[PDB]
Amino acid sequence: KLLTWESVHKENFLLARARDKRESDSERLKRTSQKVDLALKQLGHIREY
Amino acid sequence: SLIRNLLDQASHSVGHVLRMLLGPWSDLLLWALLLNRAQMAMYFWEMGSNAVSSALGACLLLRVMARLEPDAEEAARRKDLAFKFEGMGVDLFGECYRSSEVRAARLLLRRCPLWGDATCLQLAMQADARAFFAQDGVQSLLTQKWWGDMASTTPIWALVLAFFCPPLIYTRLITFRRRCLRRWFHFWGAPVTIFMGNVVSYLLFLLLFSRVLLVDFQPAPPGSLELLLYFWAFTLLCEELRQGLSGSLSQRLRLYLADSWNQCDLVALTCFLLGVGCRLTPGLYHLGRTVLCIDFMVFTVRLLHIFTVNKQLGPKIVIVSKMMKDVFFFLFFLGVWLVAYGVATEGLLRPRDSDFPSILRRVFYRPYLQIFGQIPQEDMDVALMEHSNCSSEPGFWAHPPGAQAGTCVSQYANWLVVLLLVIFLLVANILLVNLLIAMFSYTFGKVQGNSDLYWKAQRYRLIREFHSRPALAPPFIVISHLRLLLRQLCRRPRHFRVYLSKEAERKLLTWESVHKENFLLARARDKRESDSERLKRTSQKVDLALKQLGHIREY
Amino acid sequence: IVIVSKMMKDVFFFLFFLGVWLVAYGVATEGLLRPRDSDFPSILRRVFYRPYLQIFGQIPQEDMDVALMEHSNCSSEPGFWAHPPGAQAGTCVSQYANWLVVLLLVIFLLVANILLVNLLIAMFSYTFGKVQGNSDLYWKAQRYRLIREF
Ligand SMILES: CC(C)CCC[C@@H](C)[C@H]1CC[C@H]2[C@@H]3CC=C4C[C@@H](O)CC[C@]4(C)[C@H]3CC[C@]12C
Ligand SMILES: CC(C)CCC[C@@H](C)[C@H]1CC[C@H]2[C@@H]3CC=C4C[C@@H](O)CC[C@]4(C)[C@H]3CC[C@]12C
Ligand SMILES: CC(C)CCC[C@@H](C)[C@H]1CC[C@H]2[C@@H]3CC=C4C[C@@H](O)CC[C@]4(C)[C@H]3CC[C@]12C
Ligand SMILES: CC(C)CCC[C@@H](C)[C@H]1CC[C@H]2[C@@H]3CC=C4C[C@@H](O)CC[C@]4(C)[C@H]3CC[C@]12C
Ligand SMILES: CC(C)CCC[C@@H](C)[C@H]1CC[C@H]2[C@@H]3CC=C4C[C@@H](O)CC[C@]4(C)[C@H]3CC[C@]12C
Ligand SMILES: CC(C)CCC[C@@H](C)[C@H]1CC[C@H]2[C@@H]3CC=C4C[C@@H](O)CC[C@]4(C)[C@H]3CC[C@]12C
């Protein structure tokens, strides 16, 4: 029972700090960076028009 | 949860609020508070009316319910919700005060029908909203009330000189807000005037008590001055008893048991009563004089607590209450080292005067005085005493010249005694005292900021107590006591509360609503212009652009 | 020099606190021991000046402690007196509760020489740290003023 309880709480803690890292400003900036470069590439695939 | 059980208990039966509630925006707000819906409560507060009073009542209810909470997590969430509520309330108060000083002032003493018809200040005090009391606007308002009808910007020396010279009331100086009688009553009923009268009466009491104690305290029956002092203390005890009963007879007694200087005042009066009893009974004259002498110290100490309302001393008077743990640590450490050195030297040198009081003196009192410059070097060092066979034990003794240093000390290891004195001087006069200085510095730096915040609320409390205090001085307060007894006796045959206009109520309601909506718009603009929110807005713009461009890839 | 002007509030607080405690202790000891020299200047001396000098190492231990004085019937009141050897300590002191007098001297030494002085040191340190930066800025303008006057 305590094994299951601590497993539940540890997975909650993993999810919590993962969400914190994702909502961190630097990680948001890098995600916007791989969005912008991907957009630039996908326009680069349609420049022939 | 903590809601259904309390509702069932109420059905089967702050307490008055529970009695009134049974299973427009105010109802939703209180429902969110009891259900602990943070966002719902905030929305109801920002959408409702009388926002300041509603927030203060919400903070009070959350504090009380968190104190009643059995579970730490719910208590913590409730108390942080109360903290944020107090923060938004004080921000609203500041933005309201920054526009209309007089309108903000008249908002306070408004009797809000919600929360049991309690004034906003009383709600903050019962909620211990020290952050709210620390606000500059409420500080200025309490200053004005303490200088009630007394031109709060007036200098202190002008006020005191007017106090000694009543005729100077009608002069170009000492401005204010039957004209003669109204001026007289307004000047003599001001809380600051009452404070000055009580201060001068208390200094007169200290002078009288000292004069009776030092000179006119013969075993002969008490004279005119001592009888006057007995009447004096009777008036003081009557005043204190009346104050305790005013500010449920047993319930109020338990409350008065707290506020520990009210406790010190009470113990002072009891010690004075024991002193008078011992003085009157023939046997206990000396004991009565001794206990009266201690009672003088207790009264003089209470003077310090009474005179704490000064704006430049009060924070430090609050500080010195926080130094007791530090001085207790120093006292314990010095006690241990003092036992060490005292017993060691009392063993190394063996005086023939082995009486118990003399031993308890030479072990504790003398080494204690070694700290403050009283070093009996000629009493404890072998070179400074003349050698003589003052004892029959086979050794060298060198009887010292001290009166209480022993008639015949030993000298076998007096070099070790000298070295031990050197070590004691190093430990006590150098290590311990300087360490205590350092830890005073650290604790002072830690606690001064919180002490100022506490002193704001304590000053508000003292202003309230002096406002409730009757006008007449302790020499003449017996007249006020008889007046009060008449008011209770004349009933048998039969706090600020400034009035506001009915239309002015709606006017101030609209004003505070406009200011609160402006404040909400301001904070919304601030959070929108915040960098993180700008970043999330750019993120949603960019991934929306990616999504919309994903719909034209088929081209 | 600009700083030392800002220490006046702190030293005034210390002076007031020491005044209160000094009044309490001085009157208490002046009542506990009853010198026959009850002249007003002598009382104002033994209550204020002597306890003040107890702070700076001048402790009239042989003047206030019963064990250090010789016992004598220097008064007709029914008690034990032990006339002290001091010049201004009273011609005939009393000794009924001189153990309490000694304990009260110990408490006074603990309060004044330890608590008050070290607290004053601490608050000087805090105020100095707070005000030195502003004092330098003020001293710039004050120096300009002095240069202009000279
Ligand atoms: C604030 C308090 C503690 C100050 C204490 C000072 C006290 C000790 C002073 C103030 C008034 C003084 C009295 C005034 C006048 C006389 C005249 C004469 O009879 C000698 C002593 C006697 C009777 C003084 C006794 C000492 C006295 C009571
Ligand atoms: C001389 C004997 C009576 C020892 C006690 C004297 C002093 C230290 C006592 C008497 C009144 C007491 C104060 C009573 C009330 C308060 C308010 C509280 O919020 C902080 C402590 C504080 C400020 C106490 C501090 C200690 C105090 C000042
Ligand atoms: C740290 C604490 C526990 C130390 C205890 C105090 C000790 C060191 C000292 C202080 C007073 C001293 C006592 C003084 C007087 C007497 C009476 C004598 O006929 C026997 C020794 C005896 C009984 C002493 C015993 C030791 C004593 C109690
Ligand atoms: C506060 C702590 C660290 C200091 C130690 C307390 C000392 C000073 C106390 C505890 C017992 C007290 C003693 C009690 C009894 C006597 C006998 C008397 O004839 C002279 C004073 C004298 C000797 C007292 C002096 C003060 C005393 C020694
Ligand atoms: C024995 C008596 C007369 C000693 C008098 C010492 C007084 C007058 C001295 C000591 C510190 C000095 C102060 C030093 C610093 C300042 C700050 C400056 O902006 C105005 C002058 C002022 C306030 C000085 C005034 C004079 C001063 C207060
Ligand atoms: C600054 C505060 C805290 C300290 C108290 C002030 C004291 C030291 C002052 C106030 C009255 C003054 C006394 C005035 C009169 C006399 C009588 C004279 O024959 C000896 C000095 C003596 C006894 C003075 C000593 C100093 C004194 C006692």
Numbering used by the authors:
A (entry chain B): 1120 to 1168
B (entry chain A): 471 to 483, 503 to 512, 558 to 711, 766 to 835, 851 to 1097, 1108 to 1168
C (entry chain C): 920 to 1069
Give sentences copied directly from the paper behind this entry.
Transient receptor potential (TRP) melastatin 4 (TRPM4) protein is a calcium-activated monovalent cation channel associated with various genetic and cardiovascular disorders. We determine three cryo-EM structures of full-length human TRPM4 embedded in native lipid nanodiscs without inhibitor, bound to NBA, and an anthranilic acid derivative, IBA. We determined cryo-EM structures of full-length human TRPM4 in endogenous lipid nanodiscs in apo (HsTRPM4apo), IBA (HsTRPM4IBA), and NBA (HsTRPM4NBA) bound states at overall resolutions of 3.7, 3.6, and 4.5 Å respectively.
Of the three, two cholesterol molecules (CHR-1 and CHR-2) bind in similar positions to CHS molecules in a previous structure in a reconstituted nanodisc. One of these molecules (CHR-1) interacts with the S6 helix close to the channel pore, and another (CHR−2) in a pocket formed between S3 and S4 helices and the S4-S5 linker equivalent to the VBP of TRPV2; however, the density for this cholesterol molecule is weaker compared to CHR-1, suggesting lower occupancy. The third cholesterol molecule (CHR-3) in our structures binds between the S5 and S2 helix from an adjacent protomer differing from the previously reported position of CHS at the pre-S1 elbow. The presence of the ligands in this pocket suggests that these ligands can displace the endogenous cholesterol molecule (CHR-2) present in the HsTRPM4apo structure, which is possibly not tightly bound as judged by the weaker density map for this molecule compared to other bound cholesterol molecules. Indeed, this suggests the binding of endogenous Ca2+ ions in the SMA extracted TRPM4. Still, we cannot rule out the possibility of other endogenously derived ions occupying the binding site. However, we found that in native nanodiscs, densities for the cytosolic regions of TRPM4 are poorly resolved compared to previously determined structures, resulting in lower-resolution 3D reconstructions in these regions, which could be a result of TRPM4 solubilization using SMA. This effect was more pronounced in the cytosolic N-terminal TRPM homology regions 1 and 2 (MHR1/ 2), with the density in these regions much less defined.
